[PDB]
Amino acid sequence: PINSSQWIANGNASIFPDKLLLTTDDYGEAGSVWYYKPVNLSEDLVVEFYAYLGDNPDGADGITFTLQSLGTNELGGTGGDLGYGGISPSVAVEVDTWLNDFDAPATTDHIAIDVNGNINHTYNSLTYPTPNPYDLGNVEDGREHLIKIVWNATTKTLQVYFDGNLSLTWNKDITQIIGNSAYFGFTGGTGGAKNLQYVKPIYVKNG
């Protein structure tokens, strides 16, 4: 179901016939996979994918869905950077499976909106501002989780659904951060803790 010609893998990521592998269950990884054609953010964007965050609750570090207006070679930091930290201009939806000091006020595995490659939730909330991170409890349960991301180019809003539950919303015009055109894709990291991490894209609709 994955057409490998449509995806560009960087770092420790690999394109498989049925999934986008972001990290293997090994230390110090960063992986990214970008879709080959940019989307037009003056139209709506809906992305649905299954995410797998591993089977070890004591593992790390998490994944993102990222919109960024650079290109298909971008790869952010390892570990708590989730393969995303440093990429700008960007907006990311992180699924974060390791509590770093900069993750306050999160208390569990969490989903959050990050901007321009910043993964510090207090900084982003003081600067942009982004919403607080949303605690999911443990998502390193060896199950695939359904994530749906909705950009509405009329209302200038973003919604994020996890396992069918509205988890985050945002009222910032993301085109004023990244421009009207962006690559989309996925990133993952591991550090001093680890997990197998992958996504299975289901549906992408632009307009």
Binding Ca ion by CB under 5 A: which of 98, 170, 184, 186?
98
Two tokens, residue 100:
């770093």
Give the shortest CB-196-to-ligand BMA separation in angstroms. Answer: 14
Report how far residue 161's alpha carbon sits from residue 69's, in angstroms, rounded to the nearest whole number. Answer: 24
Residue 116 contacts which entry, Ca ion, ligand BMA, Mn ion, none (Cβ below 5-8 A, type-dependent): none
CA dihedral in degrees (46, 48, 52, 57; nearest 10)? Answer: 60
SS3 content of the chain, % helix, strand, coil (to 5): 10, 45, 45
H runs (alpha helix) in the chain:
121-127, 175-178
Position 81 contacts Mn ion (CB under 5 A): no
Binding Mn ion by CB under 5 A: which of 29, 81, 103, 140?
103
Residue with smaller CB distance to ligand BMA, 25 or 163: 25
Residue with smaller CB distance to Ca ion, 49 or 98: 98
What's phi and psi for 167, nearest 5 deg?
A: -120, -35
Binding Mn ion by CB under 5 A: which of 61, 81, 96, 140?
96
Instruction: Kindly tell me the burial class for residue 170, based on how many C-beta atoms sit within 10 Å of its own C-beta (0-12, 13-18, 19 or more).
Output: buried
Stretch 146-205 residues interacting with Ca ion (CB under 5 A): none
Binding Ca ion by CB under 5 A: which of 54, 76, 80, 191?
80
204 in the Ramachandran plot: left (φ > 0), alpha (ψ -120 to 50) or beta? beta
Residue 190 contacts which entry, Ca ion, ligand BMA, Mn ion, none (Cβ below 5-8 A, type-dependent): ligand BMA
DSSP-derived letter for residue 131 is P
Stretch 14-33 residues interacting with Mn ion (CB under 5 A): none
Residue 191 contacts which entry, Mn ion, Ca ion, ligand BMA, none (Cβ below 5-8 A, type-dependent): ligand BMA
Position 84 contacts Ca ion (CB under 5 A): no
Strand arrangement, sheet containing 20-23: 14-15, 20-23, 197-206, 45-52, 144-152, 157-162, 165-170
Residue with smaller CB distance to Ca ion, 84 or 151: 84
Q: Report the interface residues with Mn ion, using CB under 5 A.
A: 96, 103
Q: Report the interface residues with Ca ion, using CB under 5 A.
A: 80, 96, 98, 100, 103
